[PDB]
Amino acid sequence: MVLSEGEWQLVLHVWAKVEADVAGHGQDIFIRLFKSHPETLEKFDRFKHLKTEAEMKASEDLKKHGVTVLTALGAILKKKGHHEAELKPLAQSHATKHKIPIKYLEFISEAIIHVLHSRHPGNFGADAQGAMNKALELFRKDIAAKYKELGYQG
Template identity: 40%
Template sequence: MCDWDLINKVWAKVEEDLAGNGQTVLLRLFEEHPETKAHFPKFKGIPLGQLTSNADVKTHGNTVFKALGDVVKQKGKHASNLQALATTHINKHKIPPQNFTLITNVILKVFAEKFPGEMTAPAQEAFSKAFKAICSELEDLYKKGGFQS
């Protein structure tokens, strides 16, 4: 069981700059896992150093974090959110399911750095459990959706 109340308490801090925090996570994802950039047509041909000032990265970071916030706020009752997310990422974006694990690992690191007061050991554990559950559910949806990478 995840401590959704604790997660949402931290998430309130994240929402103070949703787009900026999403941008930071995407940039770190591209830095730590350069292969993931290939799944973003707007970004794949742009060197990482130039992406830091790219408005589209911030816009997409906002989109990613808005979707994640919608999941977090459901406090575990997020099946319809994940179904919609899986459907678009399988059929439209063709994003491999393991990329969700990559980005959630990056999120944990970035949050620990940016919000050390909020990302206590219990908060880190709560996010870790929630992200593992979400990624597992997404992998199941991908299998049901017949995803071919």
């Protein structure tokens, strides 16, 4: 699949807002993910002990992790589709070291959309959300293709 320049512009416009506070967006996204799909928390040995949202918000390590994840996702989005190089190491670590099913990538994509919708309604209308969903589906499609090449079905 391919996004038009117009769709990329909608994606990058709202992402520019996210970049005004990466750490804050990272926390909301992971808390949303862990609360909506608790099973995903079991994949993080470093955070699986967190019991409440209060504990999650207070975790310095979780906040730092969120910045690392969003920064990588941002680098990929800014390539506007030409992200083959950025995807390689990401796909290998998540398929071989962390063992993350495509299903879980769908869950975090939902968390991202939810948080952007909550925080940036003025820059995340129907068209912009459609553009973001398309960019995330492209991301998941390409990561899935790499998973297969690497020998991981998940």
